[PDB]
Design a protein around this ligand. Sequence first.
Ligand SMILES: *[C@@H]1O[C@H](CO)[C@@H](O[C@@H]2O[C@H](CO)[C@@H](O)[C@H](O)[C@H]2NC(C)=O)[C@H](O)[C@H]1NC(C)=O
Ligand SMILES: *[C@@H]1O[C@H](CO)[C@@H](O)[C@H](O)[C@H]1NC(C)=O
Lengths: 49, 97
Amino acid sequence: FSRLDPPEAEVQIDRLITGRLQSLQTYVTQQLIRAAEIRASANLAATKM
Amino acid sequence: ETKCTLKSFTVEKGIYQTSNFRVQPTESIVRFPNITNLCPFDEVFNATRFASVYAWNRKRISNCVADYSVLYNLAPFFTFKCYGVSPTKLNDLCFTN
Ligand SMILES: *[C@@H]1O[C@H](CO)[C@@H](O[C@@H]2O[C@H](CO)[C@@H](O)[C@H](O)[C@H]2NC(C)=O)[C@H](O)[C@H]1NC(C)=O
Ligand SMILES: *[C@@H]1O[C@H](CO)[C@@H](O)[C@H](O)[C@H]1NC(C)=O
């Protein structure tokens, strides 16, 4: 924002916002699969105790 | 705001996540370094003769003030086509080499 003027800054900052959004969707998506493997083992420990 | 974040009017018993708290700034400081001196920009733009294309002139500029006000006044408006930085932000950002 300090270097370029406001109009094309949007083009540049839109790449970083969309880049970090899909860089953070992949975190949530992989967390939902790991928690589906822990829950497959928490339900195996609950039926083992 | 608990009623606002649940989009309702009767919230239920429990714990919610309203928002986050940010400590706001108190004051502002601007501390670029202690140097002052008029720049040799007047030689390179008001020189009588420029060098040829195959042997172009050399100039090193240091210990100045980056004043970009006389650029639009020496000549009428023409192209700048400035890639790394916008032309109007030159004074605020400060310069390196
Ligand atoms: C080259 O010389 C010209 C005049 O001979 C300078 O033009 C003026 O410079 C002063 C300096 O502050 C400005 O206030 C005026 O508005 C300028 N007038 C015009 C018509 O340009 C010019 O600045 C000099 N070049 C450089 C790089 O300093
Ligand atoms: C800036 O530099 C000059 C000489 O180098 C010195 O006299 C002056 O005290 C300096 N300014 C500050 C605030 O120290």
